[PDB]
Write a protein that binds this ligand. Structure first.
Ligand SMILES: NC(=O)COc1ccccc1
Ligand SMILES: NC(=O)COc1ccccc1
Ligand SMILES: NC(=O)COc1ccccc1
Length: 287
């Protein structure tokens, strides 16, 4: 396991790496970081060059100032440049949460850069906007996104030894038994080293708050309405963040899709049920 920086699109991003061969690139979301992919890295690094990126703003990655530095086009370009910078023209892209918001958008725009997409809980660009418009449960579930627009949010997340973040991801994971003591320390270190401000900046560029923005077909601007590469969804049904109906009718937008639903996994199946997840991944990668 190697840990290093790569300079792309005007920033230095930290990533962890293991193995060699075809690139399997993992994108985490909020408030995680590259470490959340540890079990997939260990599983696949004899078959792939497994690389888990820390997104800009997160953990040891550079934390550029200003909201403009966290706009979708910039984040998408980060991904393109990371792929090329590592020496590849395409990859197997594995994504979750904000990394899925970015990763889906990337795959729609650059399907030539993605051999296969594996997506965990997170917003599909078309179905998410539909669910925000019509699914009262999704609307309630996504209320915190309005709250995140507010300057007061960071203190709730950081105060008392990151109490808000601990409550969000640590306490559920320790209680359910999928976080070790070293995992907890790794998360706490990621929050000391990273910037919660930068993490929140991602949300503060979201266009889902005006009646006009809500009208748009995709979460982020896209000319492409179909993605035809092979795609696997691996979804925790108990996720309080994204309702299961986000998967409804998804074939219209992603014709070659396979879906695996974990009845008793929540927001982050990749580390909640790594063995089940890993076998589903093997199966998809081999078919
Ligand atoms: N864990 C989270 O709150 C992330 O939620 C979102 C992630 C991406 C785009 C919109 C919302
Ligand atoms: N109820 C609506 O039409 C809008 O709902 C939401 C829109 C954005 C974030 C949270 C909720
Ligand atoms: N990261 C989030 O916003 C949600 O985090 C979790 C939520 C429920 C169970 C596990 C993690």
């Amino acid at each position: 396991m190697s840990k290093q920086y790569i300079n792309v699109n005007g920033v230095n991003l930290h990533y962890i790496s293991k193995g060699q061969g075809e690139l399997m690139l993992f994108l985490h979301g909020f408030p995680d970081f590259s470490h959340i992919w540890r079990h997939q890295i260990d599983e696949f690094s004899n078959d792939f060059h497994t690389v888990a990126l820390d997104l800009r703003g997160y953990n040891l990655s550079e934390k550029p100032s200003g909201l403009e530095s966290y706009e979708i086009d910039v984040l998408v370009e980060d991904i393109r440049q990371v792929i090329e910078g590592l020496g590849y023209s395409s990859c197997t892209l594995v994504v979750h949460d904000w990394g899925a918001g970015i990763g889906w958008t990337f795959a729609y725009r650059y399907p030539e850069y993605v051999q296969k997409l594996i997506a965990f809980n997170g917003p599909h660009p078309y179905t998410f906007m539909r669910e925000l418009r019509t699914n009262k449960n999704q609307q309630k579930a996504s209320e915190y996104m309005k709250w995140f627009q507010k300057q007061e949010v960071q203190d709730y997340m950081e105060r008392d030894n990151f109490s808000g973040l601990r409550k969000l991801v640590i306490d559920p994971g320790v209680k359910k038994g999928y976080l070790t003591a070293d995992d907890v320390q790794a998360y706490m270190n990621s929050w000391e080293n990273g910037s919660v401000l930068s993490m929140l900046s991602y949300y503060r560029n979201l266009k889902i708050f005006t009646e006009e923005d809500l009208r748009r077909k995709s979460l982020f601007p896209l000319e492409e309405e179909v993605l035809n590469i092979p795609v696997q969804i691996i979804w925790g049904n108990q996720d309080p963040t994204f309702m299961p109906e986000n998967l409804d009718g998804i074939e219209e937008y992603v014709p070659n899709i396979s879906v695996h639903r974990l009845a008793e996994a929540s927001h982050a199946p990749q580390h909640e049920k790594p063995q089940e997840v890993n076998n589903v991944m093997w199966n998809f990668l081999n078919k």
